[PDB]
Each structure stands twice: as C-alpha cells, then as structure tokens.
Amino acid sequence: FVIRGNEVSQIAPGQTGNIADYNYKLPDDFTGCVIAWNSNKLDSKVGGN
Amino acid sequence: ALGKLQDVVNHNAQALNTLVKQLSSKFGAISSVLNDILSRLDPPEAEVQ
C-alpha cells in the first residue's frame, strides 16, 4: 500500500491511528518485516496525485 | 497464657492481609489497577505493564 510520510510509525502492532484502525490493522503477535521507501518520483504529480 | 494459639491466628490473618496489601503495589509499573493500564496505554507497552 501507499501511505504518508508521517504514518509509517502507525504500521506497527498495537498502534492507535486512522489508517491503523480503519485501513490496515496489524495483530499484536505479528512477525515479519515492514519495508517503507519514498515514492515521490513515481507516485506523485505536480497537479496532485 | 494462650499466646501460642493466638499467635497462629495472628500469623494467618496477617499473611492474608499482606497478600491483599500486595495488590496495592505498583511493582515498578505506572499503576496498580489493570483497568487504568488497559484504558491508558497501547498494547505494546500495556503488555509490559
């Protein structure tokens, strides 16, 4: 998925947030890795993406 | 005269009182009440408390 720059802390177990609660929820016993990288070059437009 | 028997009674009640008193001990946590810990913290740190 694609999120904001400040919302990368919310992709974690047990977090209270808007995308955490209503978009993507992680379990408390989650195992694995979260990968986040900037996509300004591809997922942004000057007029607004 | 009857110090020994009373002592046994004295020990037993005191032990229960001490055990009950131990419920009011933070034990290095923010609060001694489980409901407050659940109502105030996220599960990653609430689990620790």
Curated annotation (Swiss-Prot), chain A:
Region: Integrin-binding motif, residue numbers: 4-6
Effect of V46P: In strain: Omicron/XBB.1.5, Omicron/EG.5.1
Function: Attaches the virion to the cell membrane by interacting with host receptor, initiating the infection. The major receptor is host ACE2. When S2/S2' has been cleaved, binding to the receptor triggers direct fusion at the cell membrane. When S2/S2' has not been cleaved, binding to the receptor results in internalization of the virus by endocytosis using host TFRC and GRM2 and leading to fusion of the virion membrane with the host endosomal membrane. Alternatively, may use NRP1/NRP2 and integrin as entry receptors.
Quaternary assembly: Binds to host ACE2. RBD also interacts with the N-linked glycan on 'Asn-90' of ACE2. Cleavage of S generates a polybasic C-terminal sequence on S1 that binds to host Neuropilin-1 (NRP1) and Neuropilin-2 (NRP2) receptors. Interacts with host integrin alpha-5/beta-1 (ITGA5:ITGB1) and with ACE2 in complex with integrin alpha-5/beta-1 (ITGA5:ITGB1). May interact via cytoplasmic c-terminus with M protein. May interact (via N-terminus) with host bilirubin and biliverdin, thereby preventing antibody binding to the SARS-CoV-2 spike NTD via an allosteric mechanism.
This protein's name: Spike protein S1
Organism classification: Viruses, Riboviria, Orthornavirae, Pisuviricota, Pisoniviricetes
Swiss-Prot record, chain B:
Effect annotated for changing D7N: In strain: Delta/B.1.617.2, Mu/B.1.621
Domain of life, source organism: Viruses
Coiled coil ranges: 6-49
Phenotypic consequence of L38F: In strain: Omicron/BA.1
Function summary: Subunit of the fusion protein that is processed upon entry into the host cell. Mediates fusion of the virion and cellular membranes by functioning as a class I viral fusion protein. Contains a viral fusion peptide that is unmasked after S2 cleavage. This cleavage can occur at the cell membrane by host TMPRSS2 or during endocytosis by host CSTL. In either case, this triggers an extensive and irreversible conformational change that leads to fusion of the viral envelope with the cellular cytoplasmic membrane, releasing viral genomic RNA into the host cell cytoplasm.
Name the record gives this protein: Spike protein S2'
Organism, scientific name: Severe acute respiratory syndrome coronavirus 2
Gene name, Swiss-Prot/TrEMBL: S
